[PDB]
Design an enzyme around this catalytic site. Structure first.
Site, PDB file in Angstrom:
ATOM      1  N   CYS A 109       5.757  17.333   2.985  1.00 50.62           N
ATOM      2  CA  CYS A 109       6.245  18.636   3.417  1.00 50.62           C
ATOM      3  C   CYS A 109       7.767  18.627   3.318  1.00 50.62           C
ATOM      4  O   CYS A 109       8.419  17.622   3.531  1.00 50.62           O
ATOM      5  CB  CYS A 109       5.749  18.987   4.862  1.00 50.62           C
ATOM      6  N   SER A 167       9.802  19.651   5.409  1.00 49.18           N
ATOM      7  CA  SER A 167      10.398  19.229   6.678  1.00 49.18           C
ATOM      8  C   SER A 167      10.596  17.707   6.750  1.00 49.18           C
ATOM      9  O   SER A 167      11.523  17.228   7.380  1.00 49.18           O
ATOM     10  CB  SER A 167       9.579  19.645   7.881  1.00 49.18           C
ATOM     11  N   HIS A 184      13.747  17.200   5.021  1.00 45.51           N
ATOM     12  CA  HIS A 184      14.882  17.570   5.893  1.00 45.51           C
ATOM     13  C   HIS A 184      15.371  16.357   6.747  1.00 45.51           C
ATOM     14  O   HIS A 184      16.575  16.309   7.068  1.00 45.51           O
ATOM     15  CB  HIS A 184      14.493  18.725   6.827  1.00 45.51           C
ATOM     16  N   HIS A 191       4.035  14.079   8.999  1.00 43.79           N
ATOM     17  CA  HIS A 191       3.420  14.939   9.986  1.00 43.79           C
ATOM     18  C   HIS A 191       2.256  15.773   9.538  1.00 43.79           C
ATOM     19  O   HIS A 191       1.568  16.400  10.395  1.00 43.79           O
ATOM     20  CB  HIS A 191       4.450  15.878  10.677  1.00 43.79           C
ATOM     21  N   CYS A 203      -0.260  20.918   8.431  1.00 41.30           N
ATOM     22  CA  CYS A 203       1.036  21.585   8.434  1.00 41.30           C
ATOM     23  C   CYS A 203       1.079  22.767   7.503  1.00 41.30           C
ATOM     24  O   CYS A 203       1.034  23.924   7.995  1.00 41.30           O
ATOM     25  CB  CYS A 203       2.236  20.637   8.207  1.00 41.30           C
TER      26      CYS A 203
HETATM   27  N1  LIG Z   1       7.765  26.832  10.981  1.00 41.82           N
HETATM   28  C1  LIG Z   1       7.002  25.754  10.717  1.00 41.82           C
HETATM   29  O1  LIG Z   1       6.138  25.347  11.495  1.00 41.82           O
HETATM   30  C2  LIG Z   1       7.169  25.058   9.392  1.00 41.82           C
HETATM   31  C3  LIG Z   1       6.088  24.277   8.865  1.00 41.82           C
HETATM   32  C4  LIG Z   1       6.205  23.822   7.514  1.00 41.82           C
HETATM   33  C5  LIG Z   1       7.323  24.008   6.838  1.00 41.82           C
HETATM   34  N2  LIG Z   1       8.452  24.649   7.425  1.00 41.82           N
HETATM   35  C6  LIG Z   1       9.632  24.895   6.678  1.00 41.82           C
HETATM   36  O2  LIG Z   1       9.339  25.918   5.705  1.00 41.82           O
HETATM   37  C7  LIG Z   1      10.213  25.788   4.562  1.00 41.82           C
HETATM   38  C8  LIG Z   1       9.396  25.775   3.289  1.00 41.82           C
HETATM   39  O3  LIG Z   1       8.638  24.532   3.231  1.00 41.82           O
HETATM   40  P1  LIG Z   1       7.873  24.156   1.896  1.00 41.82           P
HETATM   41  O4  LIG Z   1       7.079  25.326   1.392  1.00 41.82           O
HETATM   42  O5  LIG Z   1       7.244  22.794   2.155  1.00 41.82           O
HETATM   43  O6  LIG Z   1       9.152  23.992   0.950  1.00 41.82           O
HETATM   44  P2  LIG Z   1       9.383  23.976  -0.606  1.00 41.82           P
HETATM   45  O7  LIG Z   1       8.160  23.514  -1.326  1.00 41.82           O
HETATM   46  O8  LIG Z   1      10.696  23.297  -0.857  1.00 41.82           O
HETATM   47  O9  LIG Z   1       9.540  25.536  -0.971  1.00 41.82           O
HETATM   48  C9  LIG Z   1      10.804  26.244  -0.788  1.00 41.82           C
HETATM   49  C10 LIG Z   1      10.895  27.246  -1.906  1.00 41.82           C
HETATM   50  O10 LIG Z   1      12.125  28.002  -1.681  1.00 41.82           O
HETATM   51  C11 LIG Z   1      12.710  28.297  -2.955  1.00 41.82           C
HETATM   52  N3  LIG Z   1      14.119  28.643  -2.746  1.00 41.82           N
HETATM   53  C12 LIG Z   1      15.151  27.814  -2.509  1.00 41.82           C
HETATM   54  N4  LIG Z   1      16.261  28.510  -2.350  1.00 41.82           N
HETATM   55  C13 LIG Z   1      15.968  29.857  -2.498  1.00 41.82           C
HETATM   56  C14 LIG Z   1      16.665  31.158  -2.501  1.00 41.82           C
HETATM   57  N5  LIG Z   1      17.986  31.180  -2.271  1.00 41.82           N
HETATM   58  N6  LIG Z   1      15.930  32.202  -2.674  1.00 41.82           N
HETATM   59  C15 LIG Z   1      14.617  32.245  -2.868  1.00 41.82           C
HETATM   60  N7  LIG Z   1      13.891  31.070  -2.968  1.00 41.82           N
HETATM   61  C16 LIG Z   1      14.575  29.928  -2.733  1.00 41.82           C
HETATM   62  C17 LIG Z   1      12.514  27.006  -3.749  1.00 41.82           C
HETATM   63  O11 LIG Z   1      12.676  27.224  -5.159  1.00 41.82           O
HETATM   64  C18 LIG Z   1      11.060  26.609  -3.330  1.00 41.82           C
HETATM   65  O12 LIG Z   1      10.050  27.041  -4.240  1.00 41.82           O
HETATM   66  C19 LIG Z   1      11.076  24.505   4.835  1.00 41.82           C
HETATM   67  O13 LIG Z   1      12.319  24.840   5.419  1.00 41.82           O
HETATM   68  C20 LIG Z   1      10.237  23.761   5.874  1.00 41.82           C
HETATM   69  O14 LIG Z   1      11.022  22.842   6.630  1.00 41.82           O
HETATM   70  C21 LIG Z   1       8.300  25.207   8.680  1.00 41.82           C
HETATM   71  O1  LIG Z   2       7.092  21.333   8.835  1.00 40.78           O
HETATM   72  C1  LIG Z   2       6.950  21.450  10.274  1.00 40.78           C
HETATM   73  C2  LIG Z   2       8.240  21.231  11.065  1.00 40.78           C
HETATM   74  C3  LIG Z   2       8.939  22.237  11.718  1.00 40.78           C
HETATM   75  F1  LIG Z   2       8.531  23.536  11.603  1.00 40.78           F
HETATM   76  C4  LIG Z   2      10.088  22.013  12.387  1.00 40.78           C
HETATM   77  F2  LIG Z   2      10.749  23.023  13.019  1.00 40.78           F
HETATM   78  C5  LIG Z   2      10.519  20.705  12.523  1.00 40.78           C
HETATM   79  F3  LIG Z   2      11.623  20.494  13.244  1.00 40.78           F
HETATM   80  C6  LIG Z   2       9.878  19.690  11.876  1.00 40.78           C
HETATM   81  F4  LIG Z   2      10.304  18.421  12.050  1.00 40.78           F
HETATM   82  C7  LIG Z   2       8.728  19.951  11.216  1.00 40.78           C
HETATM   83  F5  LIG Z   2       8.073  18.918  10.611  1.00 40.78           F
HETATM   84 ZN   LIG Z   3       5.661  20.577   7.808  1.00 40.10          ZN
END
Ligand SMILES: NC(=O)c1ccc[n+]([C@@H]2O[C@H](COP(=O)([O-])OP(=O)([O-])OC[C@H]3O[C@@H](n4cnc5c(N)[nH+]cnc54)[C@H](O)[C@@H]3O)[C@@H](O)[C@H]2O)c1
Ligand SMILES: OCc1c(F)c(F)c(F)c(F)c1F
Ligand SMILES: [Zn+2]
Ligand SMILES: NC(=O)c1ccc[n+]([C@@H]2O[C@H](COP(=O)([O-])OP(=O)([O-])OC[C@H]3O[C@@H](n4cnc5c(N)[nH+]cnc54)[C@H](O)[C@@H]3O)[C@@H](O)[C@H]2O)c1
Ligand SMILES: OCc1c(F)c(F)c(F)c(F)c1F
Ligand SMILES: [Zn+2]
Ligand SMILES: [Zn+2]
Ligand SMILES: [Zn+2]
Lengths: 374, 374
Positions: A46, A48, A51, A67, A174
């Site tokens: 993922c 995250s 990150h 996770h 996730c």
């Molecule tokens: N809220 C939660 O519980 C939770 C859970 C899982 C993931 N996340 C977050 O969600 C986000 C996406 O995760 P993911 O899908 O695994 O990531 P990922 O696979 O990196 O997807 C991100 C997408 O964003 C695109 N992108 C980057 N910059 C831009 C821009 N300026 N404009 C438009 N598109 C852009 C990029 O090309 C990619 O396809 C990350 O920040 C994670 O940390 C949050």
């Molecule tokens: O991808 C899920 C996810 C989150 F949405 C967070 F806000 C975070 F801090 C993190 F560690 C995480 F794994």
């Molecule tokens: Zn996640």
């Protein structure tokens, strides 16, 4: 037998930020009261997790990250009642203690026992079950799935269908559940609506799946990487736009496309600027925007509150709003019943030993989810 | 008969920011098609009218302000169907055209014909009905109630009960309906919940009325003027707090008092800092915060989007979320049936000629609502 004994096994230890994982032997203590030791079967990569590597998320190091996973219970501590040795399980990065005010609330899921808000990198009891080269190693979100074996608190694990394919249902830990629930539960996307999804990775694709499941008429994918568009359309996007193709800001483009703003927008990237753009592109009087992406540590956005005064709703959520222990088994049952698909999210399947290569696929733009198999 | 003729009458003209209103003769043109000319009876002094004076709210000058009022139709233009001469009416500062996408939406009220987002200070046709010293004078919000006679578009007026007491029900044209709806319609305050209201003026008192009507168990009023607390308790506050009494920031105090954050918070002042403070004090996983106050023109707030990612909902609204033309007559009918009280909001009465004294009373902190009589 391993029960009651320290297990020496392989894990991916992150010793410092911005370096490769080190794949090496760790010791895993047996579970204490109300703890569960799990032999991992599959874990997803993922953003995250990345990150943690990049410093976008701050958590104590050294650490065993991971996770999004599934495995099989090896042993249980005294007092565990909800899983038994041999059960298939998904670790829950958002716990469900069932006792705090959030757990008792009909719409809350961000249980007060979480280790996200102010991460300690430990078990609930403030100690670690992991050592490596004589040194204690931190947990991550109570899960630490980048290891052949982990130890989790009972409130951080759910039993799932014994016939589940763990190399697929790990995504319910996730990325699938987060995106799908952000659409169906947090936004409550309506039939016939117009949605815009910023970011077409694994999570954003799952948001599209949920918007289609909810009956949206128009589902606009937004990404700067046009290689992401074909799969977005396969799972329900009706059109895709790349901000880089336009002279005007994309909020203006999206407002024009939707004849005055979208019904529902989602930020699924983790950038401050796209959080504000996503809010602005939803209709000013009745639009809803949901923040899903995780932005860089300790940075504030700037916005004009007239965007809200006109009537917009702005919200965010962890894990799609799902109460984790109640919801994960039901999601797996729904997957077994063919209610949604997970294969569209899985682009690569690698042995665990190739964890670094899996992260490089993510960072290069080439993968959606890599599943690592132990 | 005055029908079809220019009317000479007194109005309060604002020629310049940060100056007293000038009570002097203006010419009021007769209504064009789908316009209504109204003999005003009573108008309230709302803080948003003061914003025009202070430059907090930017609208073209010179202007006839006033937006919280009631009167009697003097004449109707061609094609008007919804009011007649002699009817009691409330001008609608948020119009309801009934035809735009927002008017058709079940939860929208910020009709696209509004003159709030980008004020032009005109009628719907882009012209003015007012002349003073031979110069055209702008309208305000399509209402311009600080005049013995005004002209409004048909979509900006509602017919109300013929037996209505206009010196009371004028408050349904802004401050009561805004606050009450912000609680009952926008936030949807629940029975047994804990609410925090920032700002205990006419609008914030009306929010408290709505939270009490909805069954809240705890209603915490927040104001830096402790003179405001007695009336807040009369209308339903269970406790009142002055930020100036505390060493710690008030969001921390409110989170402690509510054992982890409030269910519903309301910003009813117009400050960027208290909009962020109000969001922060609601519970992180399931809290809701509503912005009601009007911010200084063109200024952005700064906030950490983790406040939202944990699960908070942030929204704003104009006019309590009420579709204005449908709702104003029903609110008057409910007032006539004693479903809510208006008298607690009315602290002073003056003749229209004493408008400047009325503004002095608001600026000193002494009044809630002054009602001006023509
Ligand atoms: N809220 C939660 O519980 C939770 C859970 C899982 C993931 N996340 C977050 O969600 C986000 C996406 O995760 P993911 O899908 O695994 O990531 P990922 O696979 O990196 O997807 C991100 C997408 O964003 C695109 N992108 C980057 N910059 C831009 C821009 N300026 N404009 C438009 N598109 C852009 C990029 O090309 C990619 O396809 C990350 O920040 C994670 O940390 C949050
Ligand atoms: O991808 C899920 C996810 C989150 F949405 C967070 F806000 C975070 F801090 C993190 F560690 C995480 F794994
Ligand atoms: Zn996640
Ligand atoms: N959204 C809408 O449709 C709508 C309608 C009506 C009014 N408004 C706005 O709502 C706000 C309140 O209007 P009103 O009730 O007529 O005004 P008001 O009578 O001036 O009340 C504001 C209250 O805020 C108090 N206050 C000032 N600073 C602080 C502080 N730092 N902390 C706590 N309290 C403080 C102040 O003492 C006063 O009692 C104004 O900004 C109006 O412009 C918005
Ligand atoms: O008090 C109601 C009111 C508002 F809520 C505004 F946002 C505004 F711009 C305005 F002029 C006004 F009068
Ligand atoms: Zn809990
Ligand atoms: Zn309309
Ligand atoms: Zn007002």
């Amino acid at each position: 037998s391993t029960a009651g004994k320290v297990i020496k096994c392989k894990a991916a230890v992150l010793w410092e930020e911005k370096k490769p994982f080190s794949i090496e032997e760790v010791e895993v203590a047996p579970p204490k009261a109300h703890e569960v030791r799990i032999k991992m079967v599959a874990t997803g990569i993922c953003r995250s997790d990345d990150h943690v590597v990049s410093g976008t998320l701050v958590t104590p190091l050294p650490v065993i990250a991971g996770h999004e996973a599934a495995g099989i219970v090896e042993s249980i501590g005294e007092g565990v009642t909800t899983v038994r040795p041999g059960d298939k399980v998904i670790p829950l990065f958002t716990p469900q203690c069932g006792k705090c005010r959030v757990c008792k609330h009909p719409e809350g899921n961000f249980c007060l026992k979480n280790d996200l808000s102010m991460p300690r990198g430990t078990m609930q009891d403030g100690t670690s079950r992991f050592t490596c080269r004589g040194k204690p190693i931190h947990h991550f979100l109570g899960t630490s799935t980048f290891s052949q074996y982990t130890v989790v608190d009972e409130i951080s694990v759910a039993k799932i269908d014994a016939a589940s394919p763990l190399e697929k249902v790990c995504l319910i830990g996730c990325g699938f559940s987060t995106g799908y629930g952000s659409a169906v539960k947090v936004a409550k996307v309506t039939q016939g609506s117009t949605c815009a999804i910023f970011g077409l990775g694994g999570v954003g694709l799952s948001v599209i799946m949920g918007c289609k499941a909810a009956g949206a008429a128009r589902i606009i994918g937004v990404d700067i990487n046009k290689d992401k568009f074909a799969k977005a359309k396969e799972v329900g996007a009706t059109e895709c736009v790349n901000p880089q193709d336009y002279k005007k800001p994309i909020q203006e483009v999206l407002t024009e496309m939707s004849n005055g703003g979208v019904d529902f927008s989602f930020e699924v990237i983790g950038r401050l600027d796209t959080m504000v753009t996503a809010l602005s592109c939803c209709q000013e009087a009745y639009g809803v925007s949901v923040i899903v992406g995780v932005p860089p540590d300790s940075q504030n956005l700037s916005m004009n509150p007239m965007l809200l005064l006109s009537g917009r709703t702005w919200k965010g959520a962890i894990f799609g709003g799902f109460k984790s222990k109640d919801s994960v088994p039901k999601l797996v049952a729904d997957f077994m019943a063919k209610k949604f698909a997970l294969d569209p999210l899985i682009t690569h399947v690698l042995p665990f030993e190739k964890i670094n290569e899996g992260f490089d696929l993510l960072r290069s733009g080439e993968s959606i989810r890599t599943i690592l198999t132990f």
